[PDB]
Protein backbone atom coordinates (compact mmCIF):
# COMPACT_ATOMS: atom_id res chain seq x y z
CA UNK A 1 0.00 0.00 0.00
CA UNK A 2 1.04 3.68 0.16
CA UNK A 3 1.60 6.05 3.14
CA UNK A 4 2.44 5.09 6.75
CA UNK A 5 3.75 7.59 9.32
CA UNK A 6 4.94 7.41 12.92
CA UNK A 7 5.84 9.93 15.64
CA UNK A 8 7.05 9.38 19.22
CA UNK A 9 6.18 12.15 21.69
CA UNK A 10 6.65 12.61 25.48
CA UNK A 11 4.28 9.88 26.68
CA UNK A 12 2.94 8.10 23.56
CA UNK A 13 3.49 6.87 19.99
CA UNK A 14 1.15 7.97 17.18
CA UNK A 15 0.79 5.96 13.95
CA UNK A 16 -1.00 7.29 10.85
CA UNK A 17 -1.78 5.03 7.88
CA UNK A 18 -3.68 5.67 4.61
CA UNK A 19 -7.14 4.22 3.99
CA UNK A 20 -6.98 3.72 0.21
CA UNK A 21 -6.47 0.39 -1.52
CA UNK A 22 -5.83 0.64 -5.25
CA UNK A 23 -5.57 -2.08 -7.75
CA UNK A 24 -4.41 -0.63 -10.99
CA UNK A 25 -6.85 1.99 -12.17
CA UNK A 26 -9.52 1.82 -9.43
CA UNK A 27 -9.68 2.54 -5.71
CA UNK A 28 -11.43 -0.63 -4.52
CA UNK A 29 -11.69 0.60 -0.91
CA UNK A 30 -11.34 3.88 1.03
CA UNK A 31 -11.56 2.68 4.66
CA UNK A 32 -8.76 0.10 4.96
CA UNK A 33 -6.95 -0.28 8.31
CA UNK A 34 -3.27 -0.98 7.57
CA UNK A 35 -2.33 -2.07 11.09
CA UNK A 36 -2.44 -4.99 13.55
CA UNK A 37 -2.31 -5.05 17.35
CA UNK A 38 0.57 -7.35 18.28
CA UNK A 39 0.05 -6.93 22.04
CA UNK A 40 -1.97 -4.60 24.34
CA UNK A 41 0.84 -1.98 24.30
CA UNK A 42 2.37 -2.68 20.84
CA UNK A 43 0.98 -1.71 17.42
CA UNK A 44 2.41 -2.46 13.96
CA UNK A 45 1.53 -0.62 10.74
CA UNK A 46 2.58 -2.00 7.35
CA UNK A 47 2.94 -1.25 3.63
CA UNK A 48 4.35 -3.14 0.62
CA UNK A 49 3.24 -5.65 -2.02
CA UNK A 50 -0.39 -6.81 -2.13
CA UNK A 51 -1.13 -9.93 -0.05
CA UNK A 52 2.36 -10.11 1.50
CA UNK A 53 1.54 -7.20 3.84
CA UNK A 54 -1.46 -8.74 5.61
CA UNK A 55 -0.02 -12.29 5.51
CA UNK A 56 3.15 -11.06 7.23
CA UNK A 57 1.38 -8.82 9.77
CA UNK A 58 -1.01 -11.58 10.87
CA UNK A 59 1.87 -14.09 10.98
CA UNK A 60 3.79 -11.78 13.33
CA UNK A 61 0.60 -11.10 15.33
CA UNK A 62 0.02 -14.84 15.83
CA UNK A 63 3.61 -15.41 17.03
CA UNK A 64 3.54 -12.57 19.59
CA UNK A 65 0.10 -13.62 20.87
CA UNK A 66 1.49 -17.16 21.24
CA UNK A 67 4.41 -15.80 23.29
CA UNK A 68 2.05 -13.77 25.50
CA UNK A 69 -0.06 -16.83 26.35
CA UNK A 70 2.94 -19.13 26.92
CA UNK A 71 4.74 -16.76 29.32
CA UNK A 72 1.71 -14.80 30.63
CA UNK A 73 3.80 -11.70 29.92
CA UNK A 74 3.99 -8.92 27.33
CA UNK A 75 7.25 -8.58 25.38
CA UNK A 76 8.94 -5.18 25.28
CA UNK A 77 8.60 -3.14 22.05
CA UNK A 78 12.38 -3.54 21.63
CA UNK A 79 12.02 -7.34 21.88
CA UNK A 80 9.10 -7.44 19.42
CA UNK A 81 10.93 -5.20 16.94
CA UNK A 82 13.99 -7.49 17.06
CA UNK A 83 11.83 -10.57 16.42
CA UNK A 84 10.21 -8.82 13.45
CA UNK A 85 13.59 -7.68 12.03
CA UNK A 86 15.00 -11.22 12.19
CA UNK A 87 11.96 -12.60 10.32
CA UNK A 88 12.49 -10.04 7.55
CA UNK A 89 16.28 -10.60 7.55
CA UNK A 90 15.56 -14.33 7.21
CA UNK A 91 12.96 -13.55 4.52
CA UNK A 92 15.20 -11.46 2.22
CA UNK A 93 17.34 -14.51 1.30
CA UNK A 94 14.34 -16.83 0.76
CA UNK A 95 12.94 -18.26 -2.47
CA UNK A 96 10.23 -15.56 -2.42
CA UNK A 97 10.89 -12.72 0.10
CA UNK A 98 8.21 -10.84 2.05
CA UNK A 99 7.96 -7.48 0.27
CA UNK A 100 6.77 -5.62 3.40
CA UNK A 101 7.84 -2.47 5.25
CA UNK A 102 6.66 -1.86 8.83
CA UNK A 103 6.54 0.67 11.66
CA UNK A 104 6.32 -0.68 15.21
CA UNK A 105 4.92 1.71 17.82
CA UNK A 106 4.87 0.57 21.44
CA UNK A 107 4.84 1.78 25.04
CA UNK A 108 7.35 0.04 27.32
CA UNK A 109 5.58 -0.39 30.68
CA UNK A 110 8.86 -1.24 32.44
CA UNK A 111 10.77 1.91 31.44
CA UNK A 112 7.61 4.06 31.11
CA UNK A 113 8.78 5.30 27.69
CA UNK A 114 7.17 5.37 24.23
CA UNK A 115 9.22 3.72 21.45
CA UNK A 116 9.01 3.87 17.64
CA UNK A 117 10.89 1.43 15.38
CA UNK A 118 11.21 1.61 11.58
CA UNK A 119 11.96 -1.64 9.74
CA UNK A 120 12.11 -2.19 5.95
CA UNK A 121 11.69 -5.44 3.98
CA UNK A 122 15.45 -6.11 4.02
CA UNK A 123 15.37 -6.24 7.84
CA UNK A 124 16.85 -2.79 8.42
CA UNK A 125 15.88 -1.63 11.93
CA UNK A 126 16.26 1.86 13.40
CA UNK A 127 14.75 3.44 16.53
CA UNK A 128 13.47 6.97 15.78
CA UNK A 129 11.54 9.93 17.21
CA UNK A 130 9.59 10.03 13.94
CA UNK A 131 9.57 7.79 10.87
CA UNK A 132 7.99 6.93 7.53
CA UNK A 133 8.09 4.41 4.67
CA UNK A 134 7.95 4.92 0.90
CA UNK A 135 7.70 8.40 -0.61
CA UNK A 136 6.03 9.75 2.56
CA UNK A 137 9.33 10.66 4.25
CA UNK A 138 10.38 12.80 1.27
CA UNK A 139 7.69 15.33 2.25
CA UNK A 140 7.20 14.81 5.98
CA UNK A 141 10.74 14.64 7.41
CA UNK A 142 11.46 18.32 6.65
CA UNK A 143 8.37 19.40 8.63
CA UNK A 144 9.20 17.05 11.49
CA UNK A 145 12.83 18.24 11.54
CA UNK A 146 11.54 21.79 12.10
CA UNK A 147 8.61 21.25 14.37
CA UNK A 148 9.31 18.12 16.35
CA UNK A 149 10.30 18.64 19.91
CA UNK A 150 10.74 15.60 22.06
CA UNK A 151 8.70 16.81 24.99
CA UNK A 152 5.56 17.31 22.97
CA UNK A 153 2.18 16.36 24.28
CA UNK A 154 -0.11 13.91 22.45
CA UNK A 155 -2.33 16.81 21.32
CA UNK A 156 0.70 18.68 19.95
CA UNK A 157 1.79 15.46 18.21
CA UNK A 158 -1.61 15.17 16.50
CA UNK A 159 -1.43 18.81 15.33
CA UNK A 160 2.04 18.21 13.88
CA UNK A 161 0.64 15.06 12.26
CA UNK A 162 -2.21 17.06 10.68
CA UNK A 163 0.40 19.41 9.20
CA UNK A 164 2.14 16.36 7.67
CA UNK A 165 -1.08 14.95 6.18
CA UNK A 166 -2.02 18.38 4.78
CA UNK A 167 1.35 18.61 3.01
CA UNK A 168 0.93 15.08 1.61
CA UNK A 169 -2.58 15.90 0.36
CA UNK A 170 -1.18 19.02 -1.34
CA UNK A 171 1.94 17.64 -3.06
CA UNK A 172 1.50 13.86 -3.56
CA UNK A 173 -0.02 12.77 -6.90
CA UNK A 174 -1.93 9.79 -5.47
CA UNK A 175 -5.22 10.27 -3.61
CA UNK A 176 -4.69 8.11 -0.51
CA UNK A 177 -8.19 8.86 0.88
CA UNK A 178 -7.01 10.24 4.24
CA UNK A 179 -5.49 8.36 7.19
CA UNK A 180 -6.53 6.29 10.20
CA UNK A 181 -4.70 7.55 13.30
CA UNK A 182 -3.94 5.40 16.35
CA UNK A 183 -2.33 6.33 19.68
CA UNK A 184 -0.21 3.97 21.80
CA UNK A 185 0.43 4.93 25.44
CA UNK A 186 0.45 3.54 29.02
CA UNK A 187 -3.31 2.82 28.88
CA UNK A 188 -3.02 0.82 25.64
CA UNK A 189 -4.13 1.45 22.05
CA UNK A 190 -7.01 3.65 20.87
CA UNK A 191 -8.23 5.05 17.53
CA UNK A 192 -8.87 8.74 16.84
CA UNK A 193 -12.25 8.48 15.06
CA UNK A 194 -12.26 12.10 13.76
CA UNK A 195 -9.26 13.15 11.64
CA UNK B 1 31.64 -23.63 -51.87
CA UNK B 2 35.02 -24.93 -53.03
CA UNK B 3 36.95 -22.66 -55.40
CA UNK B 4 40.60 -22.39 -56.42
CA UNK B 5 42.94 -20.83 -58.98
CA UNK B 6 46.39 -22.22 -59.86
CA UNK B 7 49.19 -20.70 -61.98
CA UNK B 8 51.32 -23.06 -64.08
CA UNK B 9 53.92 -23.03 -66.89
CA UNK B 10 51.56 -22.08 -69.75
CA UNK B 11 49.24 -19.81 -67.72
CA UNK B 12 46.51 -20.23 -65.09
CA UNK B 13 43.53 -22.51 -64.40
CA UNK B 14 40.40 -21.70 -62.37
CA UNK B 15 38.38 -24.43 -60.63
CA UNK B 16 35.05 -24.61 -58.80
CA UNK B 17 32.19 -26.82 -57.62
CA UNK B 18 28.57 -26.25 -58.74
CA UNK B 19 26.51 -26.26 -55.51
CA UNK B 20 24.31 -23.38 -54.29
CA UNK B 21 22.55 -23.87 -50.94
CA UNK B 22 19.76 -22.25 -48.95
CA UNK B 23 20.61 -23.81 -45.59
CA UNK B 24 20.67 -27.55 -46.28
CA UNK B 25 18.51 -27.40 -49.45
CA UNK B 26 20.57 -27.38 -52.65
CA UNK B 27 18.90 -24.54 -54.59
CA UNK B 28 21.06 -25.25 -57.66
CA UNK B 29 23.25 -28.33 -58.23
CA UNK B 30 24.69 -27.20 -61.61
CA UNK B 31 25.82 -23.64 -60.79
CA UNK B 32 28.59 -21.90 -62.76
CA UNK B 33 30.82 -20.11 -60.23
CA UNK B 34 33.58 -19.42 -62.78
CA UNK B 35 32.61 -16.08 -64.32
CA UNK B 36 34.06 -13.84 -66.97
CA UNK B 37 34.97 -10.19 -66.42
CA UNK B 38 37.19 -10.04 -69.53
CA UNK B 39 38.39 -12.26 -72.42
CA UNK B 40 41.26 -13.74 -70.40
CA UNK B 41 40.43 -12.41 -66.93
CA UNK B 42 38.01 -14.62 -65.00
CA UNK B 43 37.06 -14.98 -61.34
CA UNK B 44 35.85 -17.58 -58.85
CA UNK B 45 32.94 -16.53 -56.64
CA UNK B 46 32.18 -17.52 -53.03
CA UNK B 47 29.83 -16.11 -50.37
CA UNK B 48 26.56 -14.40 -51.27
CA UNK B 49 25.43 -15.26 -54.81
CA UNK B 50 23.67 -11.89 -55.14
CA UNK B 51 26.65 -9.85 -53.89
CA UNK B 52 29.25 -11.66 -56.01
CA UNK B 53 27.07 -11.45 -59.14
CA UNK B 54 26.39 -7.74 -58.57
CA UNK B 55 30.13 -7.13 -58.03
CA UNK B 56 31.17 -9.22 -61.04
CA UNK B 57 28.65 -7.40 -63.26
CA UNK B 58 30.02 -4.00 -62.16
CA UNK B 59 33.63 -5.13 -62.73
CA UNK B 60 32.82 -6.44 -66.23
CA UNK B 61 31.30 -3.03 -66.96
CA UNK B 62 34.39 -1.20 -65.64
CA UNK B 63 36.83 -3.36 -67.65
CA UNK B 64 34.69 -3.10 -70.81
CA UNK B 65 34.87 0.70 -70.47
CA UNK B 66 38.60 0.51 -69.63
CA UNK B 67 39.22 -1.52 -72.80
CA UNK B 68 37.36 0.97 -75.02
CA UNK B 69 39.65 3.77 -73.81
CA UNK B 70 43.01 2.28 -72.79
CA UNK B 71 43.13 -1.20 -74.37
CA UNK B 72 43.34 -4.58 -72.62
CA UNK B 73 43.64 -4.27 -68.81
CA UNK B 74 46.13 -6.22 -66.69
CA UNK B 75 44.99 -8.86 -64.19
CA UNK B 76 46.34 -6.59 -61.42
CA UNK B 77 44.04 -3.81 -62.68
CA UNK B 78 41.03 -6.16 -62.60
CA UNK B 79 41.90 -7.25 -59.04
CA UNK B 80 42.14 -3.59 -57.99
CA UNK B 81 38.62 -2.87 -59.28
CA UNK B 82 37.29 -5.91 -57.36
CA UNK B 83 39.14 -4.69 -54.25
CA UNK B 84 37.78 -1.15 -54.52
CA UNK B 85 34.19 -2.47 -54.53
CA UNK B 86 34.79 -5.07 -51.79
CA UNK B 87 36.77 -2.76 -49.47
CA UNK B 88 34.64 0.40 -49.73
CA UNK B 89 31.43 -1.64 -49.26
CA UNK B 90 32.80 -4.12 -46.68
CA UNK B 91 29.98 -3.40 -44.17
CA UNK B 92 27.24 -4.45 -46.63
CA UNK B 93 28.95 -7.25 -48.62
CA UNK B 94 29.64 -10.95 -48.10
CA UNK B 95 31.94 -11.83 -50.99
CA UNK B 96 35.09 -13.97 -51.23
CA UNK B 97 36.51 -13.66 -54.73
CA UNK B 98 39.56 -15.12 -56.49
CA UNK B 99 40.71 -13.19 -59.56
CA UNK B 100 42.76 -15.04 -62.20
CA UNK B 101 44.00 -13.91 -65.62
CA UNK B 102 46.53 -14.40 -68.42
CA UNK B 103 48.70 -11.66 -69.94
CA UNK B 104 51.43 -12.31 -72.51
CA UNK B 105 53.85 -10.05 -70.62
CA UNK B 106 52.99 -11.20 -67.07
CA UNK B 107 51.72 -14.70 -68.01
CA UNK B 108 49.48 -16.41 -65.40
CA UNK B 109 48.56 -14.45 -62.26
CA UNK B 110 46.26 -15.11 -59.29
CA UNK B 111 44.85 -12.57 -56.81
CA UNK B 112 42.66 -13.59 -53.86
CA UNK B 113 40.26 -11.14 -52.17
CA UNK B 114 38.80 -12.37 -48.85
CA UNK B 115 35.95 -10.77 -46.81
CA UNK B 116 37.81 -7.68 -45.55
CA UNK B 117 38.64 -6.44 -49.06
CA UNK B 118 42.40 -7.04 -48.84
CA UNK B 119 44.37 -8.18 -51.91
CA UNK B 120 46.93 -11.00 -51.96
CA UNK B 121 48.94 -12.01 -55.02
CA UNK B 122 49.76 -15.73 -54.81
CA UNK B 123 51.10 -18.62 -56.96
CA UNK B 124 47.80 -20.39 -56.22
CA UNK B 125 44.75 -19.63 -54.07
CA UNK B 126 41.91 -21.55 -52.41
CA UNK B 127 38.65 -20.21 -50.96
CA UNK B 128 35.08 -21.03 -49.95
CA UNK B 129 33.80 -23.10 -47.02
CA UNK B 130 35.28 -26.30 -48.48
CA UNK B 131 38.79 -24.86 -48.82
CA UNK B 132 39.40 -25.39 -45.07
CA UNK B 133 39.59 -29.16 -45.65
CA UNK B 134 42.35 -29.00 -48.31
CA UNK B 135 44.91 -26.53 -46.89
CA UNK B 136 47.01 -29.53 -45.86
CA UNK B 137 46.64 -31.34 -49.18
CA UNK B 138 47.21 -28.31 -51.43
CA UNK B 139 50.26 -27.07 -49.50
CA UNK B 140 51.90 -30.52 -49.74
CA UNK B 141 51.08 -31.12 -53.42
CA UNK B 142 51.50 -27.70 -55.09
CA UNK B 143 54.59 -27.12 -57.24
CA UNK B 144 55.48 -24.10 -59.39
CA UNK B 145 55.69 -24.40 -63.20
CA UNK B 146 53.50 -27.52 -63.46
CA UNK B 147 52.17 -28.74 -66.81
CA UNK B 148 48.55 -28.33 -67.96
CA UNK B 149 47.78 -32.01 -67.29
CA UNK B 150 49.41 -31.92 -63.84
CA UNK B 151 47.53 -28.74 -62.86
CA UNK B 152 44.18 -30.20 -63.96
CA UNK B 153 44.90 -33.28 -61.82
CA UNK B 154 45.92 -31.10 -58.86
CA UNK B 155 42.68 -29.07 -59.02
CA UNK B 156 40.56 -32.17 -59.72
CA UNK B 157 42.00 -34.06 -56.72
CA UNK B 158 41.86 -31.00 -54.44
CA UNK B 159 38.23 -30.06 -55.15
CA UNK B 160 37.26 -33.76 -55.00
CA UNK B 161 38.35 -33.82 -51.34
CA UNK B 162 36.76 -30.43 -50.61
CA UNK B 163 33.46 -31.72 -52.04
CA UNK B 164 33.79 -35.00 -50.09
CA UNK B 165 33.95 -33.28 -46.69
CA UNK B 166 32.04 -29.99 -47.16
CA UNK B 167 28.24 -30.21 -47.32
CA UNK B 168 28.05 -26.77 -48.96
CA UNK B 169 30.16 -28.06 -51.87
CA UNK B 170 29.12 -30.60 -54.51
CA UNK B 171 27.86 -31.41 -58.00
CA UNK B 172 30.20 -31.17 -60.99
CA UNK B 173 33.74 -29.77 -60.98
CA UNK B 174 33.94 -26.92 -63.48
CA UNK B 175 37.30 -25.61 -64.69
CA UNK B 176 38.50 -22.84 -67.01
CA UNK B 177 41.96 -22.89 -68.62
CA UNK B 178 43.62 -19.55 -69.48
CA UNK B 179 46.64 -19.67 -71.80
CA UNK B 180 48.05 -17.97 -74.92
CA UNK B 181 46.22 -20.64 -76.96
CA UNK B 182 42.85 -19.30 -75.76
CA UNK B 183 40.05 -20.21 -73.34
CA UNK B 184 39.09 -23.84 -72.67
CA UNK B 185 36.18 -25.02 -70.50
CA UNK B 186 36.39 -28.38 -68.71
CA UNK B 187 33.79 -30.33 -66.73
CA UNK B 188 34.21 -33.39 -64.49
CA UNK B 189 31.25 -35.44 -63.26
CA UNK B 190 30.78 -37.22 -59.87
CA UNK B 191 31.42 -40.73 -61.26
CA UNK B 192 34.86 -39.55 -62.41
CA UNK B 193 36.15 -37.54 -59.43
CA UNK B 194 34.60 -39.52 -56.54
CA UNK B 195 36.60 -42.69 -57.32
CA UNK B 196 39.91 -40.76 -57.11
Amino acid sequence: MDIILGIRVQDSVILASSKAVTRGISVLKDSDDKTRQLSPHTLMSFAGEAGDTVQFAEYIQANIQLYSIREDYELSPQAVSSFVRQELAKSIRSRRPYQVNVLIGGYDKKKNKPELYQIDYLGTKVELPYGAHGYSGFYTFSLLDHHYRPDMTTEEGLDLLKLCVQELEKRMPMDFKGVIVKIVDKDGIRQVDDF
Amino acid sequence: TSIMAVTFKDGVILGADSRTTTGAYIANRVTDKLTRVHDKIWCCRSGSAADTQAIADIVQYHLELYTSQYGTPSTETAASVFKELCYENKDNLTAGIIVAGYDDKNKGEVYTIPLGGSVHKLPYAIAGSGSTFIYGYCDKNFRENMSKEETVDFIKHSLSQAIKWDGSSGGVIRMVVLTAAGVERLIFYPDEYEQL
Binding site: - | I26, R29, F133
Partner: protein, 233 residues
Protein backbone atom coordinates in the same frame (compact mmCIF):
# COMPACT_ATOMS: atom_id res chain seq x y z
CA UNK C 1 17.69 -29.02 -23.11
CA UNK C 2 20.62 -29.58 -25.46
CA UNK C 3 21.65 -29.07 -29.06
CA UNK C 4 22.26 -31.95 -31.50
CA UNK C 5 25.92 -32.41 -32.46
CA UNK C 6 26.60 -35.39 -34.74
CA UNK C 7 23.44 -35.76 -36.86
CA UNK C 8 21.75 -38.09 -39.34
CA UNK C 9 19.46 -36.90 -42.14
CA UNK C 10 16.30 -38.30 -43.83
CA UNK C 11 14.73 -41.69 -43.16
CA UNK C 12 12.14 -42.67 -45.81
CA UNK C 13 9.59 -45.51 -45.96
CA UNK C 14 6.39 -46.86 -47.53
CA UNK C 15 3.89 -49.74 -47.44
CA UNK C 16 3.28 -52.21 -50.28
CA UNK C 17 0.95 -55.20 -50.86
CA UNK C 18 2.82 -57.78 -48.72
CA UNK C 19 4.91 -55.56 -46.41
CA UNK C 20 6.96 -52.41 -45.83
CA UNK C 21 10.20 -50.84 -47.11
CA UNK C 22 12.48 -48.42 -45.24
CA UNK C 23 15.77 -46.67 -46.12
CA UNK C 24 18.38 -44.21 -44.77
CA UNK C 25 21.86 -43.02 -45.81
CA UNK C 26 25.10 -43.90 -44.00
CA UNK C 27 26.28 -40.40 -43.06
CA UNK C 28 26.95 -38.81 -39.68
CA UNK C 29 27.30 -35.05 -40.15
CA UNK C 30 29.00 -32.60 -37.77
CA UNK C 31 27.37 -29.33 -38.79
CA UNK C 32 28.42 -28.65 -42.38
CA UNK C 33 31.30 -31.16 -42.05
CA UNK C 34 30.43 -34.61 -43.45
CA UNK C 35 32.39 -36.24 -40.62
CA UNK C 36 31.45 -39.95 -40.45
CA UNK C 37 30.85 -41.95 -43.64
CA UNK C 38 30.03 -45.44 -42.25
CA UNK C 39 27.08 -44.94 -39.90
CA UNK C 40 24.25 -47.51 -39.95
CA UNK C 41 20.96 -45.77 -39.09
CA UNK C 42 18.58 -48.69 -39.74
CA UNK C 43 18.53 -50.99 -36.71
CA UNK C 44 16.67 -54.32 -36.99
CA UNK C 45 14.79 -55.76 -34.00
CA UNK C 46 14.15 -59.49 -34.40
CA UNK C 47 13.13 -60.69 -37.88
CA UNK C 48 9.94 -58.59 -38.17
CA UNK C 49 10.88 -54.96 -37.38
CA UNK C 50 13.34 -52.28 -38.50
CA UNK C 51 13.73 -48.97 -36.65
CA UNK C 52 15.02 -46.08 -38.79
CA UNK C 53 16.43 -43.11 -36.85
CA UNK C 54 17.41 -39.55 -37.82
CA UNK C 55 18.77 -36.66 -35.76
CA UNK C 56 21.36 -36.81 -32.98
CA UNK C 57 23.62 -39.87 -33.32
CA UNK C 58 24.64 -40.11 -29.65
CA UNK C 59 20.93 -40.35 -28.81
CA UNK C 60 20.50 -42.89 -31.65
CA UNK C 61 23.18 -45.11 -30.09
CA UNK C 62 21.39 -44.79 -26.74
CA UNK C 63 18.11 -45.87 -28.38
CA UNK C 64 19.96 -48.71 -30.14
CA UNK C 65 21.09 -49.94 -26.70
CA UNK C 66 17.54 -49.68 -25.31
CA UNK C 67 16.22 -51.89 -28.14
CA UNK C 68 19.06 -54.40 -27.73
CA UNK C 69 18.21 -54.48 -24.01
CA UNK C 70 14.48 -54.83 -24.84
CA UNK C 71 15.10 -58.06 -26.79
CA UNK C 72 17.16 -59.48 -23.90
CA UNK C 73 14.44 -58.58 -21.38
CA UNK C 74 11.64 -60.08 -23.51
CA UNK C 75 13.47 -63.42 -23.64
CA UNK C 76 13.61 -63.65 -19.82
CA UNK C 77 11.23 -66.35 -18.50
CA UNK C 78 9.61 -66.56 -21.94
CA UNK C 79 9.51 -70.00 -23.63
CA UNK C 80 7.65 -68.43 -26.59
CA UNK C 81 10.22 -65.64 -27.14
CA UNK C 82 10.87 -66.83 -30.72
CA UNK C 83 7.18 -67.54 -31.46
CA UNK C 84 3.83 -66.24 -30.08
CA UNK C 85 5.41 -63.94 -27.46
CA UNK C 86 8.05 -62.42 -29.75
CA UNK C 87 8.43 -58.63 -29.97
CA UNK C 88 5.94 -57.03 -32.37
CA UNK C 89 6.54 -53.77 -34.28
CA UNK C 90 3.58 -52.25 -32.40
CA UNK C 91 5.17 -53.14 -29.03
CA UNK C 92 8.57 -51.73 -29.99
CA UNK C 93 7.02 -48.50 -31.29
CA UNK C 94 4.79 -47.85 -28.27
CA UNK C 95 7.79 -48.32 -25.98
CA UNK C 96 9.86 -45.76 -27.91
CA UNK C 97 6.88 -43.38 -28.13
CA UNK C 98 6.49 -43.60 -24.34
CA UNK C 99 10.18 -42.81 -23.82
CA UNK C 100 10.20 -39.91 -26.31
CA UNK C 101 7.19 -38.19 -24.70
CA UNK C 102 8.52 -38.76 -21.16
CA UNK C 103 11.87 -37.22 -22.11
CA UNK C 104 10.27 -34.13 -23.72
CA UNK C 105 8.16 -33.75 -20.56
CA UNK C 106 11.34 -33.54 -18.43
CA UNK C 107 12.68 -30.87 -20.85
CA UNK C 108 15.52 -33.23 -21.78
CA UNK C 109 14.58 -34.78 -25.14
CA UNK C 110 16.14 -37.48 -27.30
CA UNK C 111 16.82 -35.28 -30.33
CA UNK C 112 15.54 -37.71 -32.97
CA UNK C 113 12.85 -38.52 -35.50
CA UNK C 114 12.06 -42.24 -35.64
CA UNK C 115 10.16 -44.51 -38.04
CA UNK C 116 9.28 -48.05 -36.95
CA UNK C 117 8.63 -50.27 -39.97
CA UNK C 118 7.53 -53.91 -39.69
CA UNK C 119 4.96 -56.68 -40.15
CA UNK C 120 2.66 -57.89 -37.36
CA UNK C 121 1.75 -61.49 -36.36
CA UNK C 122 -1.42 -61.46 -38.47
CA UNK C 123 0.52 -60.23 -41.53
CA UNK C 124 -0.64 -56.61 -41.25
CA UNK C 125 1.80 -53.88 -42.33
CA UNK C 126 3.05 -51.62 -39.53
CA UNK C 127 4.45 -48.14 -40.21
CA UNK C 128 4.42 -45.34 -37.63
CA UNK C 129 6.43 -42.20 -36.79
CA UNK C 130 7.60 -40.61 -33.53
CA UNK C 131 9.95 -37.70 -32.73
CA UNK C 132 11.63 -35.66 -29.96
CA UNK C 133 8.26 -34.06 -29.05
CA UNK C 134 6.52 -37.45 -28.68
CA UNK C 135 4.33 -36.63 -31.69
CA UNK C 136 3.09 -39.75 -33.47
CA UNK C 137 1.34 -40.48 -36.76
CA UNK C 138 0.90 -43.24 -39.34
CA UNK C 139 0.54 -43.02 -43.13
CA UNK C 140 1.03 -45.23 -46.22
CA UNK C 141 4.29 -43.29 -46.73
CA UNK C 142 6.43 -41.77 -43.96
CA UNK C 143 9.62 -39.71 -44.08
CA UNK C 144 11.74 -37.55 -41.76
CA UNK C 145 13.59 -34.25 -42.29
CA UNK C 146 14.15 -33.42 -45.96
CA UNK C 147 12.49 -36.70 -46.96
CA UNK C 148 9.19 -35.30 -45.68
CA UNK C 149 9.46 -32.47 -48.22
CA UNK C 150 10.89 -34.39 -51.22
CA UNK C 151 10.38 -38.16 -50.76
CA UNK C 152 6.74 -38.17 -49.62
CA UNK C 153 5.50 -36.38 -52.79
CA UNK C 154 7.18 -39.03 -54.96
CA UNK C 155 6.09 -41.99 -52.81
CA UNK C 156 2.51 -40.66 -52.59
CA UNK C 157 2.23 -40.89 -56.40
CA UNK C 158 2.58 -44.67 -56.01
CA UNK C 159 0.42 -45.09 -52.88
CA UNK C 160 -1.92 -42.09 -52.56
CA UNK C 161 -4.42 -43.75 -50.19
CA UNK C 162 -5.09 -47.04 -48.33
CA UNK C 163 -6.73 -48.70 -51.36
CA UNK C 164 -3.49 -48.28 -53.38
CA UNK C 165 -1.51 -50.60 -51.05
CA UNK C 166 -2.71 -53.99 -52.39
CA UNK C 167 -2.13 -52.70 -55.95
CA UNK C 168 1.56 -51.95 -55.23
CA UNK C 169 4.18 -54.70 -55.69
CA UNK C 170 7.57 -54.96 -53.96
CA UNK C 171 9.43 -54.22 -57.23
CA UNK C 172 7.45 -51.01 -57.84
CA UNK C 173 7.82 -49.94 -54.19
CA UNK C 174 11.60 -50.53 -54.02
CA UNK C 175 12.00 -48.67 -57.33
CA UNK C 176 10.22 -45.64 -55.82
CA UNK C 177 12.33 -45.73 -52.64
CA UNK C 178 15.62 -45.97 -54.58
CA UNK C 179 14.59 -43.05 -56.83
CA UNK C 180 13.66 -40.97 -53.78
CA UNK C 181 17.14 -41.60 -52.33
CA UNK C 182 18.71 -40.33 -55.57
CA UNK C 183 16.59 -37.16 -55.48
CA UNK C 184 17.66 -36.56 -51.86
CA UNK C 185 21.31 -36.90 -52.91
CA UNK C 186 20.76 -34.27 -55.63
CA UNK C 187 19.10 -31.82 -53.26
CA UNK C 188 20.02 -32.48 -49.58
CA UNK C 189 23.32 -30.82 -48.63
CA UNK C 190 23.72 -33.18 -45.64
CA UNK C 191 23.25 -36.49 -47.48
CA UNK C 192 25.59 -39.13 -48.91
CA UNK C 193 25.63 -41.43 -51.94
CA UNK C 194 25.94 -44.57 -49.78
CA UNK C 195 22.80 -45.92 -48.07
CA UNK C 196 21.09 -48.94 -46.53
CA UNK C 197 17.67 -50.38 -47.43
CA UNK C 198 15.45 -52.87 -45.58
CA UNK C 199 12.40 -54.84 -46.76
CA UNK C 200 10.07 -56.60 -44.32
CA UNK C 201 7.76 -58.99 -46.20
CA UNK C 202 5.07 -61.22 -44.65
CA UNK C 203 6.17 -64.10 -46.92
CA UNK C 204 9.93 -63.74 -47.52
CA UNK C 205 10.73 -62.12 -44.12
CA UNK C 206 13.40 -59.48 -43.41
CA UNK C 207 15.83 -58.58 -46.22
CA UNK C 208 18.56 -56.14 -45.13
CA UNK C 209 20.59 -54.54 -47.94
CA UNK C 210 23.85 -52.73 -47.09
CA UNK C 211 26.37 -50.71 -49.12
CA UNK C 212 23.85 -49.53 -51.73
CA UNK C 213 24.78 -46.55 -53.92
CA UNK C 214 22.86 -43.90 -55.82
CA UNK C 215 23.30 -44.66 -59.53
CA UNK C 216 21.94 -43.57 -62.94
CA UNK C 217 22.50 -39.89 -62.11
CA UNK C 218 21.86 -37.10 -64.62
CA UNK C 219 24.71 -34.56 -64.71
CA UNK C 220 25.61 -34.26 -68.43
CA UNK C 221 23.35 -31.22 -68.95
CA UNK C 222 25.65 -29.25 -66.59
CA UNK C 223 28.20 -28.68 -69.39
CA UNK C 224 25.75 -26.44 -71.30
CA UNK C 225 25.10 -24.15 -68.31
CA UNK C 226 27.34 -21.06 -68.44
CA UNK C 227 27.36 -17.95 -66.26
CA UNK C 228 24.34 -16.72 -64.33
CA UNK C 229 22.49 -14.85 -67.10
CA UNK C 230 24.30 -12.84 -69.79
CA UNK C 231 27.61 -14.74 -70.00
CA UNK C 232 28.09 -16.82 -73.17
CA UNK C 233 31.58 -18.34 -72.80
Amino acid sequence: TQQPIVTGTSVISMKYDNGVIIAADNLGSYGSLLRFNGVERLIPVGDNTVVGISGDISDMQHIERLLKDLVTENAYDNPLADAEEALEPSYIFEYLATVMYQRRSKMNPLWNAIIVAGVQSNGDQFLRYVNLLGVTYSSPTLATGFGAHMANPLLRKVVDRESDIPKTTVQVAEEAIVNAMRVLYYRDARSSRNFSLAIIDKNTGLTFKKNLQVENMKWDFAKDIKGYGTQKI
